[PDB]
Protein backbone atom coordinates (compact mmCIF):
# COMPACT_ATOMS: atom_id res chain seq x y z
CA UNK A 1 0.00 0.00 0.00
CA UNK A 2 2.98 2.32 0.40
CA UNK A 3 4.66 1.03 -2.77
CA UNK A 4 1.63 1.61 -5.05
CA UNK A 5 1.66 5.34 -4.26
CA UNK A 6 5.39 5.84 -4.95
CA UNK A 7 6.63 2.93 -7.12
CA UNK A 8 9.96 4.44 -8.23
CA UNK A 9 11.36 5.44 -4.81
CA UNK A 10 10.04 2.92 -2.24
CA UNK A 11 11.99 -0.32 -1.86
CA UNK A 12 9.74 -3.41 -2.14
CA UNK A 13 9.70 -5.78 0.85
CA UNK A 14 9.60 -9.54 0.20
CA UNK A 15 9.11 -10.86 3.75
CA UNK A 16 9.95 -10.13 7.37
CA UNK A 17 13.06 -11.26 9.25
CA UNK A 18 12.95 -12.98 12.63
CA UNK A 19 16.40 -14.43 13.36
CA UNK A 20 17.40 -14.81 17.05
CA UNK A 21 21.08 -15.20 16.13
CA UNK A 22 21.14 -11.50 15.10
CA UNK A 23 22.93 -8.83 17.03
CA UNK A 24 21.51 -5.31 17.29
CA UNK A 25 23.50 -3.73 14.37
CA UNK A 26 22.13 -6.43 12.05
CA UNK A 27 18.63 -5.58 13.29
CA UNK A 28 19.29 -1.89 12.56
CA UNK A 29 20.86 -2.45 9.13
CA UNK A 30 18.00 -4.60 7.77
CA UNK A 31 15.27 -2.15 8.90
CA UNK A 32 14.38 -0.67 5.50
CA UNK A 33 11.34 -0.07 3.32
CA UNK A 34 9.68 2.39 5.70
CA UNK A 35 8.87 -0.21 8.37
CA UNK A 36 10.11 -0.64 11.94
CA UNK A 37 11.32 -4.27 11.71
CA UNK A 38 14.06 -6.07 9.73
CA UNK A 39 12.95 -6.94 6.19
CA UNK A 40 14.38 -8.37 2.97
CA UNK A 41 14.13 -6.21 -0.15
CA UNK A 42 12.16 -8.05 -2.83
CA UNK A 43 13.86 -8.98 -6.10
CA UNK A 44 11.12 -11.23 -7.52
CA UNK A 45 9.13 -8.38 -9.09
CA UNK A 46 5.80 -9.48 -7.62
CA UNK A 47 5.05 -5.83 -6.76
CA UNK A 48 5.13 -4.68 -10.39
CA UNK A 49 3.17 -7.71 -11.61
CA UNK A 50 0.44 -7.42 -8.95
CA UNK A 51 0.22 -3.63 -9.35
CA UNK A 52 -0.06 -3.88 -13.14
CA UNK A 53 -2.88 -6.46 -13.02
CA UNK A 54 -4.97 -4.21 -10.77
CA UNK A 55 -4.21 -4.95 -7.12
CA UNK A 56 -3.79 -1.79 -5.06
CA UNK A 57 -4.35 -2.63 -1.36
CA UNK A 58 -3.40 -5.43 1.05
CA UNK A 59 -6.98 -6.76 1.29
CA UNK A 60 -7.22 -8.21 -2.22
CA UNK A 61 -3.72 -9.70 -1.82
CA UNK A 62 -5.00 -11.61 1.21
CA UNK A 63 -8.17 -12.59 -0.68
CA UNK A 64 -6.06 -13.93 -3.54
CA UNK A 65 -3.94 -15.86 -1.05
CA UNK A 66 -7.12 -17.36 0.44
CA UNK A 67 -8.42 -18.28 -3.02
CA UNK A 68 -5.16 -20.02 -3.89
CA UNK A 69 -5.15 -21.85 -0.53
CA UNK A 70 -8.68 -23.06 -1.34
CA UNK A 71 -7.62 -23.99 -4.89
CA UNK A 72 -4.62 -25.95 -3.58
CA UNK A 73 -6.92 -27.77 -1.16
Amino acid sequence: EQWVLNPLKVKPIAHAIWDPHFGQPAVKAFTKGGVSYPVNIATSGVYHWWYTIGMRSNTDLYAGSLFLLFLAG
Partner: peptide
Amino acid sequence: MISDTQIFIALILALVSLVLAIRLGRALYQ
Protein backbone atom coordinates in the same frame (compact mmCIF):
# COMPACT_ATOMS: atom_id res chain seq x y z
CA MET B 1 -4.21 -3.65 6.88
CA ILE B 2 -4.69 -7.31 7.79
CA SER B 3 -6.12 -8.22 11.21
CA ASP B 4 -5.53 -11.17 13.54
CA THR B 5 -8.79 -12.88 12.52
CA GLN B 6 -7.77 -12.91 8.84
CA ILE B 7 -4.43 -14.55 9.71
CA PHE B 8 -6.31 -17.11 11.82
CA ILE B 9 -8.63 -17.84 8.87
CA ALA B 10 -5.58 -18.34 6.63
CA LEU B 11 -4.07 -20.67 9.26
CA ILE B 12 -7.31 -22.70 9.39
CA LEU B 13 -7.33 -23.03 5.59
CA ALA B 14 -3.66 -24.07 5.68
CA LEU B 15 -4.49 -26.72 8.31
CA VAL B 16 -7.29 -28.02 6.05
CA SER B 17 -4.76 -28.14 3.20
CA LEU B 18 -2.39 -30.01 5.54
CA VAL B 19 -5.05 -32.64 6.24
CA LEU B 20 -5.75 -32.98 2.51
CA ALA B 21 -2.01 -33.24 1.76
CA ILE B 22 -1.61 -35.96 4.41
CA ARG B 23 -4.55 -37.83 2.86
CA LEU B 24 -3.03 -37.54 -0.64
CA GLY B 25 0.33 -38.76 0.68
CA ARG B 26 -1.33 -41.75 2.33
CA ALA B 27 -3.25 -42.51 -0.88
CA LEU B 28 -0.05 -42.36 -2.95
CA TYR B 29 1.81 -44.58 -0.46
CA GLN B 30 -0.84 -47.35 -0.91
